[PDB]
Scaffold this active site. Structure first.
Site, PDB file in Angstrom:
ATOM      1  N   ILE A  11       0.787  -1.206  -0.105  1.00  0.00           N
ATOM      2  CA  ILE A  11      -0.074   0.180   0.050  1.00  0.00           C
ATOM      3  C   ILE A  11       0.645   1.492   0.117  1.00  0.00           C
ATOM      4  CG2 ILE A  11      -2.092  -0.876   0.853  1.00  0.00           C
ATOM      5  CD1 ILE A  11      -1.062  -0.016   3.687  1.00  0.00           C
ATOM      6  N   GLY A  12      12.220  -1.217   3.194  1.00  0.00           N
ATOM      7  CA  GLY A  12      10.943  -0.783   3.648  1.00  0.00           C
ATOM      8  C   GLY A  12       9.824  -1.046   2.830  1.00  0.00           C
ATOM      9  N   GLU A  13       8.792  -1.818   2.822  1.00  0.00           N
ATOM     10  CA  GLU A  13       7.739  -2.110   2.227  1.00  0.00           C
ATOM     11  C   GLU A  13       6.476  -2.091   3.274  1.00  0.00           C
ATOM     12  OE1 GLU A  13       7.487  -5.298  -0.580  1.00  0.00           O
ATOM     13  OE2 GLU A  13       8.859  -4.468  -2.153  1.00  0.00           O
ATOM     14  N   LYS A  29       4.673  -2.682   8.068  1.00  0.00           N
ATOM     15  CA  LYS A  29       5.822  -2.203   7.414  1.00  0.00           C
ATOM     16  C   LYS A  29       6.833  -3.231   7.767  1.00  0.00           C
ATOM     17  CE  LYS A  29       7.703   2.009   8.344  1.00  0.00           C
ATOM     18  NZ  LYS A  29       8.453   3.004   9.149  1.00  0.00           N
ATOM     19  N   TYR A  73      -3.832   1.083  11.018  1.00  0.00           N
ATOM     20  CA  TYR A  73      -4.087   1.271   9.482  1.00  0.00           C
ATOM     21  C   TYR A  73      -5.136   2.392   9.245  1.00  0.00           C
ATOM     22  CZ  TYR A  73      -6.334   0.691   4.734  1.00  0.00           C
ATOM     23  OH  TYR A  73      -6.507   0.925   3.447  1.00  0.00           O
ATOM     24  N   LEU A  74      -4.861   3.245   8.413  1.00  0.00           N
ATOM     25  CA  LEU A  74      -5.533   4.401   8.116  1.00  0.00           C
ATOM     26  C   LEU A  74      -5.742   4.697   6.451  1.00  0.00           C
ATOM     27  CD1 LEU A  74      -3.629   6.738  10.592  1.00  0.00           C
ATOM     28  CD2 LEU A  74      -6.289   6.015  10.720  1.00  0.00           C
ATOM     29  N   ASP A 116       8.714  16.736  11.960  1.00  0.00           N
ATOM     30  CA  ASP A 116       8.421  16.533  10.459  1.00  0.00           C
ATOM     31  C   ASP A 116       6.939  16.799  10.046  1.00  0.00           C
ATOM     32  OD1 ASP A 116       9.297  16.523   7.921  1.00  0.00           O
ATOM     33  OD2 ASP A 116       9.422  14.149   7.797  1.00  0.00           O
ATOM     34  N   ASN A 121       2.346  13.826   6.267  1.00  0.00           N
ATOM     35  CA  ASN A 121       2.615  13.096   7.600  1.00  0.00           C
ATOM     36  C   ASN A 121       1.408  13.334   8.272  1.00  0.00           C
ATOM     37  OD1 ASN A 121       5.283  11.995   6.995  1.00  0.00           O
ATOM     38  ND2 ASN A 121       6.103  13.911   8.079  1.00  0.00           N
ATOM     39  N   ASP A 134       4.724   9.157  11.368  1.00  0.00           N
ATOM     40  CA  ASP A 134       6.040   9.287  10.748  1.00  0.00           C
ATOM     41  C   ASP A 134       7.056  10.149  11.601  1.00  0.00           C
ATOM     42  OD1 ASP A 134       5.800   8.804   7.141  1.00  0.00           O
ATOM     43  OD2 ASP A 134       5.641   7.419   8.692  1.00  0.00           O
TER      44      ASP A 134
END
Ligand code: HG
Ligand code: HG
Length: 255
Positions: A11, A12-13, A29, A73-74, A116, A121, A134
């Site tokens: 949708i 690092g993976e 992740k 999850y968003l 950040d 974000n 993040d």
């Protein structure tokens, strides 16, 4: 191993996944560990955060050489995604800002600094709930002048970033967006602070001006900004943000 979860589509993976115990959706992740110190730090901070305005961390797992990090999850996309089809109105701007402020107020009350803050974000649930994501650091266009100068700073650096994010939400992009980031690195400390230009309400321009003070102690705190005229006149139910979520899905389908 990690068959506590079923990996769905990437949708690092990052993957959508499902918690097999409850059937709730999670974000997974997966990082190939084969520098690790930065990943290490991020995990410790997330597990130390606990707020509905901050993306939840559910745990980490090691499988072979792969770290699985289980996150909230968003599925509404980022605030940056939602700007893609076209401009926000001021209600939407205020509502998004108000939720970010609740998140900043939470973090700043817990002695944390986001460092950040930017529309990329700020993540939305499918129902329109807004949360922060993040974890010299930041993204140059949004960085406070004191951060760039590698000077001493605190949570007021996030307030400057909030002001730049308010401009991004109103105009679709931060100041200086067409310039090489290295040029922006000298412009920010040197130039007068950005202002919101264009046809916006006075309170909105005033909200932005208040955040973007080159002197950090003159910037209001997140608690104070929650009571700003612009937030109070304009912020509505987060559930109204579903309209923006739908706009993006329709837009994304037409290419
Ligand atoms: Hg956090
Ligand atoms: Hg925290």
């Amino acid at each position: 191993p990690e068959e506590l979860f079923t990996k769905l589509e990437k949708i690092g993976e990052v993957f959508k996944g499902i918690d097999n115990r409850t059937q709730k959706v999670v974000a997974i992740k997966i990082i190939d560990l084969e520098e690790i110190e930065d990943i290490q730090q991020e995990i410790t901070v997330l597990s130390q955060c606990d707020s509905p305005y901050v993306t939840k961390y559910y745990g980490s797992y090691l499988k072979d050489t792969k770290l699985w990090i289980i996150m909230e999850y968003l599925g509404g996309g980022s605030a940056l995604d939602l700007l893609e089809p076209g401009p926000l109105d001021e209600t939407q701007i205020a509502t998004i800002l108000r939720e970010i402020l609740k998140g900043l107020d939470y973090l700043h009350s817990e002695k944390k600094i986001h460092r950040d803050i930017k529309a990329a974000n700020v993540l939305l649930s499918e129902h329109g709930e807004v949360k922060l994501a993040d974890f010299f650091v930041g993204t140059p266009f949004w960085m406070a002048p004191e951060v760039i100068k590698q000077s001493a700073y605190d949570s007021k650096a996030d307030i400057w970033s909030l002001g730049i994010t308010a401009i991004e939400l109103a105009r679709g992009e931060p100041p200086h967006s067409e310039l090489h980031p290295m040029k922006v690195l000298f412009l920010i400390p040197k130039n007068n602070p950005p202002t919101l230009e264009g046809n916006y309400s006075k309170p909105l321009k005033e909200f932005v001006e208040a955040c973007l003070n080159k002197e950090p102690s003159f910037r209001p705190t997140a608690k104070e900004l929650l009571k700003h005229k612009f937030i109070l006149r304009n912020a509505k139910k987060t559930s109204y943000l579903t309209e923006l979520i739908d706009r993006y899905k329709r837009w994304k389908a037409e290419q």
